[PDB]
Design a protein around this nucleic acid. Structure first.
Ligand SMILES: *OP(=O)(O)OP(=O)(O)OC[C@H]1O[C@@H](N2CN(C)c3c2[nH]c(N(C)C)nc3=O)[C@H](O)[C@@H]1O
Lengths: 251, 52, 116, 109
RNA sequence: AUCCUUAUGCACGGGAAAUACGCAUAUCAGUGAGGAUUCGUCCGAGAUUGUGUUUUUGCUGGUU
């Protein structure tokens, strides 16, 4: 996947994204003896397809890692196993074709479980996909942090944007949200929540709006990424071309 | 000869994604929804107008 | 469609004849292919070994190393692995082991005494 | 009638949605390019042709698909697919249509 | 006044094809072109001939 390959995501080909960066996590602590301590919490693999805005989250339980050493490699194979499970649950109507993964570390271990489905193709990306930051979503993280077992939970990431809007822009906004939740995290959260009159229902993730609320919000969300990237790398925002910005946004 | 405007591309909700004409494609996602969706209706409105 | 690898007739007739029947109702591996090179097979083995090492438990990766190996080669190799990873709880390993390994009745019986 | 000239003419480009769809016939697709890759220091997968001459299909399978000899569906490009000429296209349909009439006769008779 | 049918013209929207589309101070051609046949008869408009372009016609945009 490139900046020149981006459009080919949205053809009628059924697709999946699988990104494992959030599978095994660590919490810094400070021991009572007394130095730094390290505890793992739940591992979730985020697998989602842009056309229908559907998630499949496998919530990796902490006890999954309890008795095993070299937990670096084990997680990848676990993820692969989960992915193999995922497709065999979908009938050949719903089975994908291009499964796509960001980490190149996942290409080999998938293929070993993906032999039974020779039709399915696997890609790596030169595009860093901000589904690592998807744990900044509260409702998800809540369900995840409260989860007592390895499980499966469907969601609709696009809320009801699809009713009102084609899935391409529906997914393009979702970048700006997630690209901006890698960046200045909660300080970016406040861009959404300025109005308490704007309510997140029990169903949804992103709060409901009008169209022109998003039109302005997207401008704000767009700004951070331009300021932080320049600021970190000491580059003025004003210089960049239309093209240039787009690449920054994508990663 | 330059008596007439150079034509800009037609755009649709199909063609929408892969037109990288310099105007706010990925940058403003919902601002580019409106332009095309507005654009589509303006063409149609013309069909209706020629009729009436 | 023309790369020569794919065609199996039995899929082909079953896939078709059915279609023909439907139409009527509405109206109303390859033997050519060279066997696995030793170098390439070696690649597979390493990956499966890595998987096995990654989990000493989870026999799901154990039967795969038996089954994937079995299709490619089988015989001496797989039958030794299915015995090795057998080492009690999983039923699946036991089920796998008897079928490949057994040929002979005494041995089958002995294998059965394992799961039981 | 006279050969045009051998002088070259600057290359012109276009490509839309429409012109990509036509050209797709005349380019070696992705899957078909991987047959031109020959992976060095090891023997090609070959399958013998009807004729029996072996057809090397080079990297077209992944090294884990060789060892299990799965073969790969991969991604099949529908665009090249062969399709009938204009002349020929109606001669089939016309033959078919006329044939249906024939069958009915025997149906009623 | 509504409604309905066929032809032709401009036109939004959806498809398919470019081994296809034409052109001729040029030969014939329902005063029968070119085919089918169960052998009793049945369909009825183009066929020759020379030629132009045909993995492309015009037009923009990116990146070097
Ligand atoms: O639409 P408009 O009233 O302008 O029509 P005109 O003013 O041009 O005038 C006379 C013609 O009216 C049509 N009408 C009108 N009505 C009510 C009517 C007509 N014709 C019929 N038939 C002939 C069946 N029935 C009616 O009830 C006629 O064309 C008159 O010429």
């Amino acid at each position: 996947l490139n900046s020149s390959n981006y459009a080919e995501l949205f053809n009628n080909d059924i697709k999946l994204f699988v990104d494992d960066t959030n599978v095994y996590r660590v919490t810094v602590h400070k021991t009572f003896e007394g130095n730094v301590a390290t505890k793992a919490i739940n591992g979730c693999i985020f697998t989602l397809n842009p056309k229908t805005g559907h998630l499949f989250l496998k919530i990796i339980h902490t006890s999954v890692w309890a008795g095993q050493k070299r937990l670096s490699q084990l997680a990848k194979w676990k993820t692969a196993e989960e992915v193999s499970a995922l497709v065999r649950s979908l009938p050949k109507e719903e089975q994908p074709k291009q499964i796509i993964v960001t980490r190149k570390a996942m290409l080999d271990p998938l293929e070993v479980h993906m032999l039974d489905f020779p039709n399915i193709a696997i890609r790596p990306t030169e595009l860093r996909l901000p589904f690592s930051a998807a744990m900044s979503i509260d409702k998800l993280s809540d369900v995840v942090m409260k989860a007592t077992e390895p499980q499966m939970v469907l969601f609709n990431i696009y809320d009801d944007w699809l009713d009102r809007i084609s899935s391409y822009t529906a997914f393009s906004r979702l970048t700006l949200l997630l690209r901006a939740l890698k960046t200045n995290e909660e300080s970016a959260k406040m861009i959404l929540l300025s109005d308490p009159t704007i309510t997140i229902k029990s169903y949804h993730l992103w709060p409901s709006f009008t169209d022109e609320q998003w039109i302005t919000i997207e401008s704000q969300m767009r700004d951070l990424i331009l300021t932080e990237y320049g600021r970190k790398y000491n580059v003025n925002i004003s210089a960049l071309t239309q093209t240039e910005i787009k690449d920054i946004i994508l990663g | 000869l330059g008596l007439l405007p150079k034509p800009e591309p037609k755009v649709k909700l199909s063609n929408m994604m892969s037109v990288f004409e310099n105007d706010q494609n990925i940058t403003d996602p919902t601002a580019w929804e409106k332009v095309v969706k507005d654009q589509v209706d303006l063409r149609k409105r013309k069909h209706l107008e020629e009729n009436e | 469609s023309l790369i020569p690898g794919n065609v199996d007739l039995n899929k082909l007739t079953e896939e078709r004849e059915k279609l023909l029947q439907s139409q009527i109702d509405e109206n109303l591996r390859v033997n050519s292919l060279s066997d696995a090179t030793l170098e390439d097979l070696q690649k597979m083995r390493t990956i499966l070994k890595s998987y096995r090492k990654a989990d000493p438990t989870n026999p799901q990766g154990w039967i795969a190393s038996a089954r994937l190996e079995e299709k490619a080669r089988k015989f001496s190799v797989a039958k030794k692995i299915i015995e090795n990873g057998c080492q009690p709880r999983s039923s699946d390993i036991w089920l796998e082991n008897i079928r490949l390994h057994e040929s002979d009745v005494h041995y089958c019986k002995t294998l059965v005494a394992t799961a039981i | 009638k006279a050969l045009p000239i051998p002088e070259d003419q600057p290359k012109k480009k276009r490509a839309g949605r429409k012109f990509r769809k036509y050209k797709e016939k005349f380019r070696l697709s992705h899957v078909r390019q991987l047959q031109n890759r020959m992976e060095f220091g090891k023997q090609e997968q070959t399958v013998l042709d009807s004729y029996g001459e072996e057809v090397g299909l080079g990297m077209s399978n992944t090294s884990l698909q060789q060892a299990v000899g799965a073969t790969s569906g991969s991604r099949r490009s529908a665009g090249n697919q062969a399709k009938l000429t204009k002349v020929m296209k109606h001669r089939i349909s016309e033959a078919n249509q006329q044939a249906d009439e024939f069958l009915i006769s025997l149906g009623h008779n």
